[PDB]
Design a protein around this ligand. Sequence first.
Ligand code: WIR
Ligand code: WIR
Lengths: 452, 454
Amino acid sequence: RRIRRIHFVGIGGAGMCGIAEVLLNLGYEVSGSDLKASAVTERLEKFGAQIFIGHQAENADGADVLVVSSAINRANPEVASALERRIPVVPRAEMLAELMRYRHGIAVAGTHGKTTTTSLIASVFAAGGLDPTFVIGGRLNAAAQLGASRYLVAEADESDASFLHLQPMVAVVTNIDADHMDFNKLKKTFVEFLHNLPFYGLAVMCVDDPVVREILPQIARPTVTYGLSEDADVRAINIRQEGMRTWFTVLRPEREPLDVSVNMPGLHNVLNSLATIVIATDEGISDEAIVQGLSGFQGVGRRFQVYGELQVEGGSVMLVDDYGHHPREVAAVIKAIRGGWPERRLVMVYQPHRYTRTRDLYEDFVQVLGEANVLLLMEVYPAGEEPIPGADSRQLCHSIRQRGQLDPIYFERDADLAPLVKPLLRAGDILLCQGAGDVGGLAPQLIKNPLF
Amino acid sequence: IRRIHFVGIGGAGMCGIAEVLLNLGYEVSGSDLKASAVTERLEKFGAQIFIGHQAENADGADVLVVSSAINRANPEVASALERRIPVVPRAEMLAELMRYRHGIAVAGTHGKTTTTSLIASVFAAGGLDPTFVIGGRLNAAGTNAQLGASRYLVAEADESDASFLHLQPMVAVVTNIDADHMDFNKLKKTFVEFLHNLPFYGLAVMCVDDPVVREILPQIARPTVTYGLSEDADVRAINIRQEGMRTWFTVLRPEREPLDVSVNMPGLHNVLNSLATIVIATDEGISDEAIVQGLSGFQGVGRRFQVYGELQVEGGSVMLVDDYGHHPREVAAVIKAIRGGWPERRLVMVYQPHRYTRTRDLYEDFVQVLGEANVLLLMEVYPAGEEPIPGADSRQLCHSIRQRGQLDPIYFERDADLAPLVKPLLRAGDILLCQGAGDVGGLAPQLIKNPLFA
Ligand SMILES: Cn1nc(Nc2nc(N[C@@H]3c4ccccc4C[C@@H]3O)nc3[nH]ncc23)cc1C(C)(C)C
Ligand SMILES: Cn1nc(Nc2nc(N[C@H]3c4ccccc4C[C@@H]3O)nc3[nH]ncc23)cc1C(C)(C)C
C-alpha cells in the first residue's frame, strides 16, 4: 500500500489508543510514543503496536503518517522530524473521522440527544448480536478488538472541523437548535453534512423539530422522518408513563404496530428510541432485539439522569442530575422539565464551569438561569483558571436579581447543600443538579442524606 | 435505491452520467423531447427511454437527476417533489461518480482541462482506458466500451461548482490558485478543504511554482508531491528547449534517473501540465515508455490555447492562436502565456465579449485586460439570448479603451468578414489570437483556409 506505518505521538492519550487499536485491526503497522508507560501502552503492545517511552526524533523513523494528540507541541522532536521530511501530521480528531471510510458508518448528529441516541443504537445493535464499535466524547468502545464489527456508530459534533468530512452511510439529525450561540449558517452546515451521504445512503430526520422540517426539501437523499408528528414516517403513539418506565407504540411503514418500553422517563427519550428504531429497522434488526435493547437500557450517567425521589413534608421531590454547563444545554434540560412535568416547580442548583466560559457566555447564562422558579447559584468551578471580575456566580446573582423575576441564592463550593436546600423544598418540586465541577457529587449525597 | 430517472437524459452531460450508473448496475430511466443516437446508445446499455415529458414517466423512480436546462415546473420533477422523491442536480450526481472509482480530480485556476486530458492520454498509452470529464462531458478512448468501465475516473474540479467540496478523490491536483481580475482567504480555505477530502492515504499533487499553492502547502495534512521548475520541487523540469511546436525537457523524479520527454505543444504552461501528469502516472506505476508516448502524441484540447499554425503574409508568417475564454481572468492568463513564451512578438487580439450582463458586471476588468494587446479587434457582443444593455457593449468598450490614449481598438460586427479586415494590419512575426466564445469559434478555421493567407 501507499501508507503502511502510522505513528501516534502521545498514544496513551484518552482517545488516541482507541484509534490505534482500530488501525491495527484494519491491518496497518502502528507505532506510538508516550512520556509514560501505562496499561494503555501495555494493551496496545499486546495487539502488536511498537511502543516507545520518551520522545526522540527517531521514534518517527519509517512513519508514513503521524497522528498527534492535542497535548503534543509542534517542537516535539517526532513532529519536527516528520515535518522536516514532509511526512503528513494528522490531528487525532481527523484520524477518528477517517475510520468511517472503512466501516458501515452511522453518524448521530443534531444539537440535543446525540449521546443517548448513540448509546441506545449501540445497545439495540448489541441485542441483535452485532457488537458495534461506538464513539462517545472521542472515546471508542465496543462491549474484543475495537473495529472488529462492520458497524461504527458515532456522535457527530457539528462544531468539530472533521464534521463536514465524515463519510457515513447513515446520518441522524435529532434537531437543529441555534439558541444561546447565524442560524442560517447552522442550517446550511447540516444540509452540507447530509449531502456527504451517498445518493443511496439514509438520512434519519426528526420532523418534530421545526428547523429539521424546514430543511427537509433541501436534503436530496433517501429520508425517513420520525417524531410524534402525524406526518412522520415512524411515529410514537399511545405514550404512557409508569414510574421510571415509558411505554409507547411505534408505527413503521409496512409493519404491524410495535409496543415498546424504555426504562428512563421523558418525551426526549421517546424521540431517542424512535431514531434508534428507524436505524435498527432499516438495518433489518428483529422486533425482539429492539424490544430488549430499549427495555434494558439503563441510561447515560449525568445525561438527564433521574435519581429518584427525596422525601419531604407532605410528599416528595424528583431529583434530576445533568452535567451540561453551556447555556444551550441547560436551556434544553429546563425545557425537558417544563414539557414533561408542567405543573412542578423547578428548583435548580447550578455551578458555572470556568471563569472564561462565564465571561464569554455571560448574557446567555443570565437569560437561561433565570428560567428556574428557585435558583441556587454555586461559586464557579475554576478548573485551574484565575477569577475574572464581573464574570462569576455573585455577579450572575445580581444580574438575575436586577430583572425583578427571581432572587437567586448564592452558596460556596464547600457548603453543605442538603441543609441549605431542604427548607426551600416543597412537595411536588423538581430538584435539578446542573453542571460539572463539584455538581457531580451532589445528587448521590442528597439521595443518601438523613434529611431526606 | 435501485432506479434512477433522468429528466432530459439526452443532454450532453446527462447521458454520460446515466451510462456510468448503468455500468455500476443501477436501473436507469430517462425522458427526452427527442429520440437520437444518444438515447439509442443508452438503450443498448439497458436504459428505459421515454419520449416527451409527462408526470408518470417518473413513476417508480427512487431518485431523479435533473438537467441544468430543466426546472421545477417539468411535470416529472413536480411529480417527484410532490411525492418526496429526492431530486438531484446533474452536477451533483456527476460528482458522486468518484465514490465508485479511483478518482483523479484536477483542480486550480488555470490548466485543469489540458491536464485532465493529458492524464487520460498518458493512462491510455499504458493500456488503461480511463473515463475522463471535461466541461461536464464524460469521455473514454474508443466508443466500443461503456463509460465507467475503467477503475479510473479523471475529472476537472471547478472550485466555483457547488459539488466541489463533495468530490471524494483518491488523487487531487492543484495547478495554481489565482484570484486576479475578480474574499481571498475564503478561496484558499476552499482549496485546503478540498484537499482534506482526500483520505489520509490519498495523494495531493501541488504546483509549488504557484505562490498561493506554496503558501498553503503546510496546511495539507496528506501525502504530497510538489512539481514545478522550482529547485525545491519534488518533480522538476530542467533543460527545457523549444523546437517549433515541440518542447523538450528532462524530468527529475525522486529515486529515478532523469527522464527525457517531449510534448507537441509550445509554452511553459504545457511543461507544467506535463509535470503534473508525470507525478500521477509515476505514482500509479505507469512505465516510462507510456509516459513518453502519451506526452509525445498529445495534440491538445480544442480551443484551450490551441495553436492552429501559421498564416502567410508579406515577409514571413503570423502564429494563429485560438482560445474560448470569455472572462477577464482567463484572457489575462492567455495573454501572459503569450508574453512569456514569445516576448518579442506583437500581439493582435480578436475579442468578442459574451453576454451583455457579463460585460456590464466585469466592465472595468475588460477595459484593463483587453488593453494588454498591441492591436485590438473588438467584435460586437455575443448576446446568448440576452437583450442589449446600454453602456455595456463593444462600442462602449472601444471608447473606454480609446480614451486612455494607449490603444485604439478596431471595431467590427458579428457578420463581417475578418480575413480582409485583419490581413492589411498583420505584419510578419505577429501573433493573432482569436479570443472568446460565441462567434469566435468559427474564426480561426476560416482564417487558416482563406486565400488571403494561403
Ligand atoms: C492551457 N493552459 N495550461 C495551463 N497550465 C498551467 N498553467 C500555469 N500557469 C500559467 C502560465 C504559465 C506560464 C506562462 C503564463 C501562464 C499563465 C498561467 O499563470 N500553471 C500550471 N501549473 N500546472 C499547470 C499549469 C495554463 C494554460 C492557459 C494557457 C490556458 C492559461
Ligand atoms: C438526553 N436527551 N436526549 C434528547 N433527545 C432529543 N431531544 C429533542 N429535543 C427536545 C426535547 C424533547 C422533549 C422534551 C424537551 C425537549 C427539549 C429538547 O430540545 N429532540 C430529539 N429528537 N431526537 C432525540 C431528541 C434530549 C436530551 C436532553 C434532555 C439532554 C436535552
